RNA sequence: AACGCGACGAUAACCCGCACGGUAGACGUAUAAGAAUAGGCUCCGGCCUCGUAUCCUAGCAGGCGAUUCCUCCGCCGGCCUCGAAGUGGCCGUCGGUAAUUCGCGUAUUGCAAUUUAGACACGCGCGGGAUCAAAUCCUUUGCAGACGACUUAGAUGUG
RNA sequence: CGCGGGGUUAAGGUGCCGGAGUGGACGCUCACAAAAGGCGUUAGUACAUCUUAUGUACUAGCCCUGGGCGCUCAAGCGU
């Protein structure tokens, strides 16, 4: 009576699932409209992560592993903000690897030409300790 | 006349290409696939028939046969064939020492005007130790080819004919892995 | 994102025929050299038998074809089925059109120049990105094999050999991935950590 | 030794002239700048100098290199293609040939 | 396929004169798993929207001498490897070699007017004196022959 | 409707040939002729059972029968 099934465990869409829009802002689903549209809201204190309450097309969105546990359905902006601060969505999103890639990307894009000359010089110094280590092993 | 043979055209080659070989499987023993002979003549045979269902059982069929002379076949060369999306192709061919006289006059056209230096720097390559190339060439046959045909000729010097020019064809070795049929070759 | 390459090699597996042909023909006219490998692994949408009528329909509307250049010749290999697609998308009666086809170079399987090189993919012509999941599709290899292509088992066996060589390539790349990651961890203790934070504050 | 490049230009390709179905006007040319994909990126390259460099198989100044100079006038389409006007129109057989887009005049 | 192709055998030189140094488009023209997309990878810790990545990248178009480093690159040999339309690895010789820290010269090319720098085919291509190797022709032959056409055999020999 | 430079358009178009979107939203489809045959799919209407989800007939789509290349979560149709 042993069953070994290796299938794909996708992420549910549900009330409480927070999702990522393309502008870098998060929103918590509070009621599902159709198979293609849900209505969501992000009450984050961060100006970069805030999202107005409204319809989010799921094609434009991306499902994140974070989920609010017992978010009531159709909860108004105050009630989602209460669950937002209690569960700490912003802290969990910063730990999420998707945000580190975003923060790496933004810091890379803000590099000026003179700070680009550091990195060319600076990776060269780091690379030199890499090669005597690589030649050792 | 049959449409499968018309339009009628002369054979562009006197010997005639075999055009088809039996299919090869490794499980059989190593053996060759063809030989050349010389049409000497034809005679009469009486035979004790033992064919079931035949009213001529245990009786004397009179039949006509042909006598095809077959001189011992001197083996001179080996060829290996590699498989390509544009069909089969020659990857390489290899020969031996001491190539006999009548096989060069096939390689030539005017024996008497020309002088005898066919296969000279090839035999010099065999004697002056480029053996790594023959080690390269024989192993190249082992590793890559999938069809190996041997190169051998008949000898006029044994058979009663007024010619002296030899006759070359390629004869396959089937029945084995690619490793076995080259060491035999 | 609109980068100019010397030659770009397109893997043909899982790519739709005419969408790959339309993208390739625009790059050839723009001045890009194209090499297509695995033309036997291309895909044509719809069931196999729908591909059979349009093969029979093309031979219908042409009285007295040339046996060597056209007619059923074009369907007798997968490489030249694709070449027939790109040629109808390019002004072949102009010298600009002839020049664009000389930039193209199509193959069945992966020849030895191009198995050591990098094979890219075209997202806008991928079958699994453009076709609905329930829709049925055919392979151009089995289209040409049922027309008269003779080397389907040939290109198969050379490809299963190429996988075996590729298996040894990863096993060498595995060991390089161990040593590179180990050397990164090993030299990080003596990496002068005034400068390690400098790279982290710059994105590297 | 440096072992570095010396390129100070963006690479481009001469696509075609300004044309309809069948009426081509040679006095304006179409350039695909490498890296530009929207009309927004094309707005950076407007009024930048553009050179077409080729070889002629005769030395007139000790060199077989000849240059035709021009400028990027306006964006074209939605895909970042730009319109270029040169002192003389580009040949015709340069359709799909390299074009050097300089970074001057600069407003950065 | 006489206007497709592969392998192999045998294969043209010195002297004198004299004319010039292409390519539908190099400028870092760097990057090899396979396979699936109702899954997959792995260092077995974990990881995958994102190639928005990785390598390389400073100096007279990149000098000289140091301090200083045994890192990187290149050429020849050896050992192996690569054949679907052939190539890379390792070792050794030699040459160069900002990971770090300096002292020397660049100008008046006078505020832009070509950044005259790669790869391949042979250096482009020619006229008179100068040498092998074959074939065509010749004689002959008959398994071939309407005529052409085809095939033997002629130079030392089982002629 | 004179000869030129620049800008904007109409009718038509923006997958390639071909300048311009493999653009965005929502559905449907896999190729003569009649109240015609569909145990193909979707959309709507009218009747009947039910702790005492269904099953019968229609209406509307649109399909099976009655320029090249190529396309099918379209490069087809409607807005």
TrEMBL record, chain A:
Residues 52-127 form the Large ribosomal subunit protein eL14 domain. Keywords: Ribonucleoprotein, Ribosomal protein. InterPro entries: Rib_uL2_dom2, Ribosomal_eL14, Ribosomal_eL14_dom, Translation_prot_SH3-like_sf. SUPFAM superfamilies: Translation proteins SH3-like domain (SSF50104). GO terms for cellular component: cytosolic large ribosomal subunit. GO terms for molecular function: RNA binding; structural constituent of ribosome. Coiled coil: none annotated. Pfam families: Ribosomal_L14e. GO terms for biological process: ribosomal large subunit biogenesis; translation. Belongs to the eukaryotic ribosomal protein eL14 family. This is 60S ribosomal protein L14-like protein. It comes from Chaetomium thermophilum (strain DSM 1495 / CBS 144.50 / IMI 039719) (Thermochaetoides thermophila).
From TrEMBL, chain B:
This is Large ribosomal subunit protein uL3. The chain holds residues 12 to 196 of 392 of the full protein. It comes from the Eukaryota. It comes from Chaetomium thermophilum (strain DSM 1495 / CBS 144.50 / IMI 039719) (Thermochaetoides thermophila). Belongs to the universal ribosomal protein uL3 family.
Automatic annotation (TrEMBL), chain C:
Keywords: Ribonucleoprotein, Ribosomal protein. It comes from the Eukaryota. One of its GO terms (cellular component) is cytosolic large ribosomal subunit. GO terms for molecular function: mRNA binding; structural constituent of ribosome. InterPro entries: Ribosomal_uL13, Ribosomal_uL13_CS, Ribosomal_uL13_euk/arc, Ribosomal_uL13_sf. Pfam families: Ribosomal_L13. One of its GO terms (biological process) is translation. Component of the ribosome, a large ribonucleoprotein complex responsible for the synthesis of proteins in the cell. The small ribosomal subunit (SSU) binds messenger RNAs (mRNAs) and translates the encoded message by selecting cognate aminoacyl-transfer RNA (tRNA) molecules. The large subunit (LSU) contains the ribosomal catalytic site termed the peptidyl transferase center (PTC), which catalyzes the formation of peptide bonds, thereby polymerizing the amino acids delivered by tRNAs into a polypeptide chain. HAMAP family: Ribosomal_uL13 (MF_01366). Belongs to the universal ribosomal protein uL13 family. This is 60S ribosomal protein L16-like protein.
From TrEMBL, chain D:
It holds the Pfam family Ribosomal_L35Ae. The keyword Nucleus does not apply. The keyword Ribosomal protein applies. GO terms for cellular component: ribonucleoprotein complex; ribosome. One of its GO terms (biological process) is translation. It comes from the Eukaryota. Keywords: Ribonucleoprotein, Ribosomal protein. Gene3D superfamilies: translation elongation factor selb, chain A, domain 4 (2.40.10.190). One of its GO terms (molecular function) is structural constituent of ribosome. Belongs to the eukaryotic ribosomal protein eL33 family. This is 60S ribosomal protein l33-like protein.
